[PDB]
């Protein structure tokens, strides 16, 4: 089959935050049918990153989500051709991040061409001050619109001093070929940085995702 139980990941992110350019590359592996994945990320340019690494993590593939048999899988259907996604991440203090990921497939390895751009993060805010701890688990709401798939999610970053920092995600997924469209459904997520060094030049990221419906 096109989608194998065990697959790889190759990616390169080029981006900027408040005008500060940077570049990150990574390699990883995951189990598409189990909804689990892991990757090692290395900052190649712009290091050391002057902002909270957490704003980048959800940008570093919904194929890695366990879909039950009674819910159409827009993502696994899209291959070998693949799909691409666009997303705006609106933080409560005005910081806004736009990201895109063009996903292709070469053998058993997915290739990500990522672009990330964030602006208006206050200098004394939790992102520029690196006050974030982690993203809380979430439930993404997916629905069809204009022949493509939308995914919206209320995200929250736990803060070092206590409390949370909210962000609203709005993603558009676009398959590179005609695939069956799903009915309204959900995808639970839980992304975690398992390990990292002092300035985050090296990061080990993990994610577990499962779809569910009414």
Binding residues for Cu(2+): 196, 206, 208
Residue 30 sits in the site that holds Mg ion (CB under 5 A)? no
The reply to whether 21 sits near Mg ion by the rule CB under 5 A is yes
What residue is closest to Mg ion based on CB? 47
Q: Is 119 in the site for Mg ion (CB under 5 A)?
A: no
CB closer to Mg ion, 7 vs 157: 157
54: helix, strand or coil: helix
The three-point CA angle 207-211-213 to 5° equals 155
Burial code (b: 16+ CB inside 10 Å, e: under 16) for 51-90 equals bbbbbbbbbbbbbbbbbeeebbbbbbbbbeebbbbebebe
Residues whose CB falls within 8 Å of the CB of residue 102, separated by 6 or more in sequence, listed in order: 82, 84, 112, 113, 114
For Mg ion (CB under 5 A), the number of binding residues is: 11
Among 76, 131, 189, 208, binds Mg ion (CB under 5 A): 131
Measured from the CB atom, the residue of 8 and 212 that comes closer to Mg ion is: 212
163 touches Mg ion (CB under 5 A): no
Retrieve residue 195's tokens: 């390990």
Q: How far apart are CA 212 and CA 214, in angstroms?
A: 7
Find the shortest distance in angstroms from Cβ 6 to Mg ion.
28
79 vs 83, beta carbon nearer Mg ion: 83
Of 34-63, binders to Mg ion (CB under 5 A) are 43, 47-48
Minimum separation from the CB atom of position 3 to Mg ion (A): 24
**Cα–Cα dist 137/135, whole Å:** 6
Q: Calculate Rg over the CA atoms of the chain.
A: 17
For Mg ion, the binding residues (CB under 5 A) are 16, 21, 43, 47-48, 122, 126, 131, 144, 201, 212
């Amino acid at each position: 089959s096109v989608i194998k139980p065990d697959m790889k990941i190759k990616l390169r992110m080029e981006g900027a935050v408040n005008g500060h350019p940077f570049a990150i590359e990574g390699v990883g592996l995951g189990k598409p049918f189990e909804g689990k994945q892991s990757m090692d990320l290395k900052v190649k340019e712009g290091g050391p990153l002057p902002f909270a690494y957490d704003i980048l993590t959800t940008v570093f593939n919904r194929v890695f989500a366990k879909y039950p048999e009674n819910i159409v899988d827009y993502f696994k259907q899209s291959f070998p051709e693949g799909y691409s996604w666009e997303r705006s991440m609106n933080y409560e203090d005005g910081g806004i991040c736009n990201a895109t990921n063009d996903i292709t497939l070469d053998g058993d390895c997915y290739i990500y061409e990522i672009r990330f751009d964030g602006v208006n993060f206050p200098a004394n805010g939790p992102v520029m001050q690196k006050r974030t701890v982690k993203w809380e688990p979430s439930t993404e709401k997916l629905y069809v619109r204009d022949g493509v798939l939308k995914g919206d999610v209320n995200m929250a970053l736990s803060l070092e001093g206590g409390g949370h920092y909210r962000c609203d995600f709005k993603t558009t997924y676009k398959a590179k070929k005609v695939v069956q469209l799903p009915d309204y459904h959900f995808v639970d997520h839980h992304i975690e940085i398992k390990s990292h060094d002092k300035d985050y030049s090296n990061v080990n990221l993990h994610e577990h995702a499962e779809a569910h419906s009414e």
